[PDB]
Structure formats: structure tokens, C-alpha cells
Amino acid sequence: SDETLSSNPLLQDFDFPPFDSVDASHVRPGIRALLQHLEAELEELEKSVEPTWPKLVEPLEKIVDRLTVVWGMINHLKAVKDTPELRAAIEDVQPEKVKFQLRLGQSKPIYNAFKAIRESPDWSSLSEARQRLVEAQIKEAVLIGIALDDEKREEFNKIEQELEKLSHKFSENVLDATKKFEKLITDKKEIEGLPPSALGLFAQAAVSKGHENATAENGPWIITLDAPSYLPVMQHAKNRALREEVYRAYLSRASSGDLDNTAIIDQILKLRLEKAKLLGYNNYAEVSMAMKMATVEKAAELLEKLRSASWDAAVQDMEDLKSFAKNQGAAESDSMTHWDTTFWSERLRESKYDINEEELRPYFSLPKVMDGLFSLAKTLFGIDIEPADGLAPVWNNDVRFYRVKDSSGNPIAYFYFDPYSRPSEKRGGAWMDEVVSRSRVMAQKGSSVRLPVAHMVCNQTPPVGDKPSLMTFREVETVFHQFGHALQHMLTKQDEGLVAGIRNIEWDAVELPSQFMENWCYHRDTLMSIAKHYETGETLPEEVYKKLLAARTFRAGSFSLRQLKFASVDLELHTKYVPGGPESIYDVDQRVSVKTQVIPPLPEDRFLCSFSHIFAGGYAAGYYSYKWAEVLSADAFSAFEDAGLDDIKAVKETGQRFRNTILALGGGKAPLKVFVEFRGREPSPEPLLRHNGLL
């Protein structure tokens, strides 16, 4: 009302997206008008197409870029600022958007022009990045069904449309299920063991639900299923009945009634298999592997190698917990269950290493963590990062915005950071997303390149009262992880937009720079630069750092097996499993767990209903990508170990090489080749095993 369609924020030229002025009401008109314009642009491209950059690749990027940026900003708002109105609007336009993506991807004039470039007599003279681009476009067109005759084509497109709808539904159900659970505790006794920080959070939560007399010390408390609330309960609640209840609630999220994801999963797997068959593959995992470094065989081999290396340690971890609980006179030591594991692990960790998480929190405040992280980035990669709040519109008052500068003081990139748990409207977990890519084609008139912009999103414990966000070590690692992704997007030296940043990096290599960054949390200079008391300003005592260092490999076997269980169940569901038979996804879960867990899952276990990585994310038949890339990240880190981590000259020289290979080259060179350029040789799994004490 009262504004023209032509003034819709989604239709404007912008440097930074209008995150402060876009809502549900803009989505239907904006997306539908945009799609009409992109249709006309595609028609013009197809009519004039030649196998050259100006006549094919440049006009293609302009179309792809506009849709990616605008849809990206809408989907980002869905992820961080969900509303019923925004859900409805996205649902309403999603089929039109998907129809256009299929139309574009299945363009025969575009595909034929790319094949002509591939078939050029001087192909070998084309730059590696441009060769990678052409090869990717050809492969992607076949994977989006371009080779199918019109009847099989129609079936393929119906499958794509339904999968898109189901993945959105899956994620909405997960958000809604996490949102729904509320445990009100009145009796002070039932919350025995919960530390001041958790009490302070549960009370702050109680205030927002009406209980205005609620304090941390005395007033009522609300327990929720988002991570910053859920974890402290499982770690610290002495009331075993409370642990079992909260555990069972977490484990059954989105698994019954209106929010049930079971049938959605069943349909997703059915459609994925139908898609695989249409494309001439045996199963969906083979489809997934087409764009990955791995094959089904090689992924399974790595998982089995890591599983074999982890099993004995995981068994010993279990025995250690039993022994410790028994030595405390704990009645449940004779019958330890899944709702005892986290609790007794924490008690064991406290006793064995003499470190208490609550006492560490004052040393890990977000502002100091960011300062230390930026200092590390300067040391390794030669970049200066500074606050730039006000330059770009944001969607929430807690969102930080930063400018990244090179050594000459020239901006090279920007990023947003949305750090705190906000379960009413914001997806759980942590992630990085692209905002705009580094691109020559999308540059402003006069300048050579559009600078890249990234999102980092975490869900860490929110600030309590007036104090800064005080963090756990895991939360620190999570920030370093997402920053690693942001760096690969931001520090890319490719100006070929379609292979810049993280684009066209085989999915099983994208977790390299992220997991790589996590290693530095244990690097003494880095940890000490971060760990300053938020009030006092005093540096973490040396003796405490040594305890943190000692605890690094605690339960590494168990942590490893847990990841391998996730990766193995993913692979199994997309290879051997056939939907529609008497066997359920939970039967698959039980079978795979025999070799990847020391005790069976509960029969009531419904973790699959919240496994968004594989049902509403990029990791379907691909969760193994974490461990695949962790071999790479650990080995990359071992180059610094070899060079001398106590030698700042060596650290900077090695950091520069990492900056100029892994962070610079995007998908413009095969990831194995990029890795070899950095490492000097092909990867070894020895560093990964050594770092985790599993040799």
C-alpha cells in the first residue's frame, strides 16, 4: 500500500542488502516482479548466446547473481527473523522461484555454448579458474536433468519442486519443536546442581514469560530445549529424573503430531532415490558424490578407518565414566543411560583436570574473543578487521558489522555477525552464508571488482543482565569455525564470480578452513590474548591454560564415534536403504549404531527428525564431509607445527601461503591441488589422529 511496486526494496540496486526495510509484505510482489525480469534477461541471453565470456558467462552470472543475492537475503531473514507471515510468503513464491531455477539450469542454448567452449581447439590455454567454471556448468546441467527427454524431464521437475517444499517444512518443524518445550520449575530442590550462569538464564527466561519477580537466586525458572539451556541441564542437573525428562524431550523434537518429521523424511528419501534413477545412478549417494572429491567407496573407507581408530578409546571412555560414577557412590553406575553420560562426563572432567567451566566463563567474553580472533587473523593473513556498524542495514540490534582491510588500509571485504541464541525466531546451530560474492562482472562502473560480504551466525549463550556474553570453550571454537568459512569467502583472490570464495569447492573440502581455525583455540599466544577476565582484566593463569591443554583429548574416542555414527547413518540411508519397505529409518539407525556407538540408542530415539544437515541442508549423503575435510584441516595445521609454532617468522610465512592457496583460490582449482600447493604433498590422516590422541 502507498508505495509503488517499482520501489520494492528487493528490486533496487544496493551495495548492502536492505535487511532493515524488507518484510513478508515485500516478498510476493518483489520475487514475482524479479522473476519476470530474469525471464526476459534469460530470453535475451539465449537469443544472443555465443561461446564467449561476454555472450555467455557474463550475462549468465548477472542473472544467477541477482537471484542468489535477493533469494539469499529472504532465506537469511527466514533463518534469523522467522515470522508466520514470512513463512507463508516464501511458501507462496517458492514454486515459481524453483520453476525458474529449473528453466535456467535446463537451458539448452546455455549448455550447448558451454560444450562449445569445452570442445574448443585451444581449451588448454583457458585459465584454470575458467576451465573449472565451464566444467562445473556442464556437470551441473546434467545433474539438473538437462539430458532427460520431456516426459522424464517433467517427472524430474516435480521431484525437485517437492524436495524444496519438504526441506523447508522440515526446518520449520525443527524450529517449532525447539520453541514449544517449556519446563517451569518452582521447587528450588529440583534444580540442584545448575550453576549461577544457567540459573541467571532460566530466570531471565522466566521474566519474559510473565514471572516478573523471578531472580536467579530464588525466583522461578524456565527450562528450554535450545542449546544454551539444554546443555547446562544435561551437564549439571543432579536430579536424574529432570535429566531423563529433558533428554527425552530433546530426543523426540519434531517426531509426533503436527510437527512430525518422520513422514517428511520418508518422502524425501523416496524422491531422492527416484531422482537418482532418473539420472541413471543406483542411489542418491552416487548423485551426491558426482560433485564431491570422494566416492561412496572412498567415503566409507575413511569412516571405517576412523571408526577402527576410535572404537577402543570410546569403550574405555564408557568404562571410565562407570568407574568414576561408582567411586562417587552413584546408584546409576550399575545402569548408566544416555541421560547420565553428559553429567558424569562433566564430573569426571572437573575431577581429572581440575577445571570448572563456570569459573572459566568470566575469561571468555565475546568482545575479547573477537579482538583475539582478529589479532590472529592479522598475524596469519595480514588483514585488519574493524567495526563498521552503521555502514550496512541490519535486522537486529545485536548484529555486528565489520570491515576487512588489507595492509594498505584498502577495504577488501565485510561481514555481519549475529551471535546469540534467539529461539523464538532464529534457527539453531551455527553457520556461515554468502551475502554477495567477489565478482568482476558485478563491479560498479569504474571499479574492478565487487567486494565479497559474508554472514556469520552463532547461537551462543545470550548476555545476562548488563554483562557481556560469557562463553564456554566450545562456543569460542564455534566462533573460530564460522570465521574460517567467512575468511575463505572474503579473502578469495578469484574475481570470476561463479568460482569465487567457497563457490564450486567440492563439498567435502568446504569444512577445511573452518575446522582449521579451531586448532588455534589451543595455541598459547592466541588463547592468552583472548582469556582476560571481563571485569578484572587479568590474564588467565598459566596453570589453568595447562589444564585446558591437558583436557583437549578427553573423550576424543567418544566424540569421534558420535560424528562417525552421524556420517554412517547418512550414507546408509542414501545407499542401501529403500523407502516403502517394512524397514524404518529408525531400524537403520539401530543397525548402524551397533558399530558406531558403545551402547544402543533408546528405542524412542528420534534424532533423525532434527538432523537438518541431511534433510534441510547441504550435507545429504555428505555428512562425512566434516571428517573428510578434518583430515585436510589437521594436516594443514601440521604445516605450522612443522614450521615452528614458537617462531613468529615461520607462523607468518606459513600463514601467508595458506592465505594464498586455501583462502585465495575458491573453486577455481581442484581442492586436492590447492591442498597440495599449500602442504607440499598429498594429505595424511596421521595429524588428525595425533591431535586427538588416537594413533
Binding site: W431, D433, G617
Partner: peptide, 4 residues
């Protein structure tokens, strides 16, 4: 999304 590059998750974690």
C-alpha cells in the same frame, strides 16, 4: 549454508 556452510554449517558446523
Amino acid at each position: 549454508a556452510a554449517a558446523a
